[PDB]
Write a protein that binds this DNA or RNA. Sequence first.
DNA 1: CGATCACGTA
DNA 2: CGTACGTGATCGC
Length: 577
Amino acid sequence: AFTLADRVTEEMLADKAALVVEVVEENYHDAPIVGIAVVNEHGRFFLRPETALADPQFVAWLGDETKKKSMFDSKRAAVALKWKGIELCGVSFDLLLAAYLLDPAQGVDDVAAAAKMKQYEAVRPDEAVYGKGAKRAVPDEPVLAEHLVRKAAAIWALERPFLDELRRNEQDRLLVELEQPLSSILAEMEFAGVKVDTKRLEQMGEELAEQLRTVEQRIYELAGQEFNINSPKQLGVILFEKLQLPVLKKTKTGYSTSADVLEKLAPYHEIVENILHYRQLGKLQSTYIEGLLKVVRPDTKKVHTIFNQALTQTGRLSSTEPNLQNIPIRLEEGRKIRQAFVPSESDWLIFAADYSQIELRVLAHIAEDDNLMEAFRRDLDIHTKTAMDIFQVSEDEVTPNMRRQAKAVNFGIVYGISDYGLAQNLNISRKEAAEFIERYFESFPGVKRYMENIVQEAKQKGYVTTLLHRRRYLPDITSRNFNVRSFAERMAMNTPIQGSAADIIKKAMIDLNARLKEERLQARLLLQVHDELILEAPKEEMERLCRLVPEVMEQAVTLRVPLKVDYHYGSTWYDAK
DNA sequence: CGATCACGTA
DNA sequence: CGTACGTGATCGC
């Protein structure tokens, strides 16, 4: 039972309401609002957006901090309203972020999935209402209005049970003081966007398109035949059938043609080096040149990513359209992609600051390993120091390969990769890899104690927690399937590390945003990617930012070891190196 | 169309 | 058998 309102009335502008501002397009930037539902103490209302968003009282109610709203995925509504010059304020409860903190593994992506967690089923999933894929469409107003009111009614009914469970888990402050404030900060960053020099991307593309055409012609002469190099199965016929190259690894479909297999086949035939070079070049061309160009808004000539705040099981942010968290850096040919990201105003610069080894520093603090804490208190090179300890040699005697192997051990912790995966990584035997690990644990007995304890804790409690009380349930921790149990064990070890690092970065983002406003700076957060924050600011602000941003990031939390931030600035993202 | 699969980037 | 997102091909439709 609901009012399909033709006009905004005062009873819809109570100071506590469940609100639904429906944006059905997946990319909500500059996207239509198809309807509005308000549920409060006085009733349930469906409003047409062409009515409500033109009503000054409704817009003023939207923007009034003291008018508390409860929503699901408020960031989608806030950004969509920003593109119409309308501020959304006073969102005191976000059901999507509540459900994500309670159990990230549920994959809660609509109101109905969140409602299921509390045995509430009087709302349909969005997919049942809008369809999927090709058939996706907005239904007519009677069907649309009911779905929106039911979602608002669900939000109305579910706020108190979700808050009760958050408080029981000691996660109420995590929602109210971290994730929800962060959601506003991410909305501003998405709306601001990042300026892209499309002409530089296009000139790189023409460069790649000439080099690809050369390598591809080379590959056809070496195969003595033309074929689709991008088809792994065709390429596998060329390599393993016509060229009789040894089959070192088989996928479930057929033969593996991954980069790491191909580098071991390089000595046998000159086609291999060229296939590798075609793969790196075509990855840049298809994924990063034509990929980025496709999502530059031609009106703003910016990219406006969407940060997914309620996706990963560790608490890390994710980002899409474009994904800027996998923009090339390691290889120089690909690193130059970052030259395409420029300040959005003349006389501004890009400022990037990044945590140095935040994960291992979190580990040192969590495990209280005296050796690992001393290494960071001395600001050592952690890979060199780990090589010194593992191999029981002095700093003068650490070769590059010893350092590369200690580095692989350290990354095998930061990422929770398997005992087996270290062997694959170092290309060694597993008994070699596992003996590396035992020497590491003899050099770092606190890390070992931590790994044993956190696994036991995960089995005993059913989950692990981060510094700021995020949790990840690990039901596969009791599995009799060894491969399944091991992963759960590795996630027991890895999640308090990666997730605590994610907590710290999020807190830094909140602390920075407040400091920037306190300092009356024009600098704006643009991007968070792994352990890095990227800003743009006037040329005139670089010196103050050189002191402010690292200070804020280093003080976000206090651990038993210091946090270290590196920072640079330049006329492009690439140059902020 | 759409879903599976193999590849790769961070 | 790390956290992801995106591209291409293939194959059923």
